[PDB]
Amino acid sequence: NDVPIIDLQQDHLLIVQQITKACQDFGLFQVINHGVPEKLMVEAMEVYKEFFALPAEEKEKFQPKGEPAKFELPLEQKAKLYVEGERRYWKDTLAHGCYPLHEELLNSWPEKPPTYRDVIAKYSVEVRKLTMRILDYICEGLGLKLGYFDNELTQIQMLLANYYPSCPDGGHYDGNLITLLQQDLVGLQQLIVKDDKWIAVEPIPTAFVVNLGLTLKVMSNEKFEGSIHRVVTHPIRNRISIGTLIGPDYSCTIEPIKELISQENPPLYKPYPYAEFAEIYLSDKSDYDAGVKPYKINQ
């Protein structure tokens, strides 16, 4: 496995160097000793195991007008079941916003299992906290002031809990800024561009896989790579994974961070509305970066 595993209790400068190199080379890495309670990660996975085992009577409560929603605008934050492209569906996703944790938002979350709201609220807070630490390591690697992304660029925090039914014998960037993913079974693969080859991202049940989204690829002016990754169906196990997809509010304007831009390293994208990007990203799957192709410049 060539995917870096970065221990967040090493000396501070080694963390920054390792994260920086991973962001430049792959756009994907794993973190361990990351400060999120292991007992909470286990409880959250147990919550989704139970949720996906509930009977139809419960699951229908998350299916607007009798069927799962699609990832299409407007992308609401209330909890809903989603599907995304059929295969030989292939994936059920429970998704909802998590930030800020409002009463009206929490009130849309599952009531069963009865621990869902307490466990997943605590998990959201912890995963967010860790996500903001990692962005700050990225700030130091890019030479940006700490806290640069602690604003509307991280205003939206979508939890996407995925269930992949087994089959005996899908690639994308995430369009947002940064994603943390918890898994405990093989199935996640990263595209190694230089070989045009898919490789396994080893499942470490107490680690988080960190992958950079298209928005960060653009804002770093391609100093950092976004991760192109996919999931292959498990031949034996139903697989569950928990993604926390953090990024801009839909009222944001995305552009290469001006402080990174020079005469020698000009901007590679013009500014665009995130909401306009989001529409293309969700609709046009003709290429991985179709969402940002209309904004490319200096090529």
Ligand X SMILES: CN1[C@@H]2CC[C@H]1C[C@@H](OC(=O)[C@H](CO)c1ccccc1)C2
Site size toward Ni ion (CB under 5 A) is 1
47 scored as a contact of ligand X (CB under 6 A) = no
Draw the binding track, 240-279, toward ligand OGA (x: CB under 6 A; -: no contact): -x-x------------------------------------
230 is in an annotated binding site: no
162 appears as a binding residue in the annotation: yes
Name the residue number minimizing CB distance to ligand OGA: 241
Instruction: Pick the binder of Ni ion from 84, 174, 226, 240 (CB under 5 A).
Output: 174
Binding mask 26-65 for Sr ion (x = CB under 5 A): -------------------------------------x--
CB of 110 or CB of 243, closer to ligand OGA: 243
CA atoms within 13 A on the CB side of 38: 8
Look up residue 191 and give its two tokens.
């595209």
Candidates 31-39, 169-177, 188-196, 198-206; binding stretch for ligand X (CB under 6 A): 169-177
Q: How far apart are CA 248 and CA 216, in angstroms?
A: 10
When CB distances are held under 5 to 8 angstroms depending on the partner's kind, the choice from Ni ion, ligand X, ligand OGA, none that residue 278 binds is ligand X
Number of other CB atoms surrounding residue 121 within 10 Å: 15
The Cα 118–Cα 44 span in angstroms is: 10
Site for ligand X (CB under 6 A): how many residues?
Answer: 14
Q: How far is the CB of 90 from Sr ion (least distance, A)?
A: 17
Candidates 135, 160, 178, 216; binder of ligand X (CB under 6 A) is 160
Q: Which does 59 bind (CB under 5 to 8 A by kind): Sr ion, ligand X, Ni ion, none?
A: none
> For residues 26-85, which are near ligand OGA according to CB under 6 A?
none
Task: Give least dist CB 189 to ligand OGA, A.
Answer: 9
Token pair 């492209």 is found at 85
Q: Is 162 in the site for ligand OGA (CB under 6 A)?
A: yes
Which residues does a gap of C–N over 2.5 Å follow in the chain?
A: 88, 169
Residue 124-163 contact track with Ni ion, rule CB under 5 A, x = bound: ----------------------------------------
Among the listed ranges 30-38, 41-49, 102-110, 274-282, the one in contact with ligand X (CB under 6 A) is 274-282
DSSP the chain: --S-EEETTS-HHHHHHHHHHHHHHTSEEEEES-SS-HHHHHHHHHHHHHHHTS-HHHHGGGSGGGS-B-S-SS---S-EEEE--------EEEEEE-SS--HHHHTTS--SSTTHHHHHHHHHHHHHHHHHHHHHHHHHHHTPPTTTTSSGGG-EEEEEEEEE-------EE-SSSEEEEEESSS-EEEEEGGGTEEEE----TTSEEEEE-HHHHHHTTTSSPPPEEEEPPPSSS-EEEEEEEEE--TT-EE---GGG--SSS--SB--EEHHHHHHHHHH--SSTTTTTGGGB---
Question: Rule CB under 6 A: which of 184-213 touch ligand X?
Answer: none
Q: Can you name the residues that pair with 192 across neighbouring β-strands?
A: 197
Residues that bind Sr ion (CB under 5 A): 63, 66
Residues that bind Ni ion (CB under 5 A): 174
Residues that bind ligand OGA (CB under 6 A): 160, 162, 174, 181, 183, 187-188, 229, 231, 241, 243
Residues annotated within the binding site for 2-oxoglutarate are: 162, 164, 239, 241
